[PDB]
Amino acid sequence: MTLKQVIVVRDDLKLSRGKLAVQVAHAAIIGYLKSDSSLRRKWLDEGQKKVVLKVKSLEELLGIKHKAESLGLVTGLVQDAGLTEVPPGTITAVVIGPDEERKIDKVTGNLPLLKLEHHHHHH
């Protein structure tokens, strides 16, 4: 049916993104491997619906990930897994199993990200 695998990353952490991005990148793999172990081999075996997007807001993510988990979907907010005290401090990485690209589209916004950098304007 409509199966979709996507890891969303909440980038733009007013706090130093240097080391925090480093620990999360490592945790992103442990988090990814945690679900990707046998779950990806199940449906992701095709490897044609694997994509990564950004998160709109921590509150919206914690709320929809729970909604996705509600149907028995493997979802969880991935953060410094080595630690387990204050979730804040790091960015908000999340791993979502075979979601329905149909709902992830509106919820995670699969529309091309707009360039927040200086794009162009005849300048």
Side-chain angles (χ1 to χ4, degrees):
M1 305 212 278
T2 160
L3 288 70
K4 173 63 137 54
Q5 197 263 21
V6 166
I7 304 86
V8 220
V9 301
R10 186 184 189 202
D11 199 280
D12 209 331
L13 186 84
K14 308 186 275 290
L15 280 149
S16 278
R17 279 175 37 203
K19 144 167 177 25
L20 285 305
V22 167
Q23 169 48 68
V24 173
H26 282 315
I29 302 168
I30 309 320
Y32 179 98
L33 288 173
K34 179 170 59 157
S35 200
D36 163 287
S37 185
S38 199
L39 225 86
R40 261 42 135 185
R41 238 289 196 287
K42 196 195 296 101
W43 91 101
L44 188 129
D45 150 67
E46 301 186 22
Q48 61 188 42
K49 15 108 294 307
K50 201 297 202 97
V51 178
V52 171
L53 299 176
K54 276 184 177 87
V55 172
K56 48 239 291 139
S57 222
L58 190 98
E59 188 183 20
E60 187 67 25
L61 172 53
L62 189 116
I64 62 101
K65 80 81 122 179
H66 200 41
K67 183 177 106 178
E69 189 182 0
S70 195
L71 60 122
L73 202 93
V74 159
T75 114
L77 87 176
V78 182
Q79 297 184 5
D80 306 2
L83 268 61
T84 167
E85 273 279 9
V86 245
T90 146
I91 105 192
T92 292
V94 42
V95 69
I96 313 167
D99 18 80
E100 307 183 351
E101 39 174 57
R102 311 188 71 198
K103 97 90 184 316
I104 219 180
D105 256 276
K106 8 175 152 162
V107 164
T108 63
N110 196 103
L111 323 188
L113 303 179
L114 51 125
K115 305 227 297 229
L116 59 107
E117 309 181 355
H118 276 22
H119 175 14
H120 223 45
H121 243 71
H122 113 273
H123 274 298

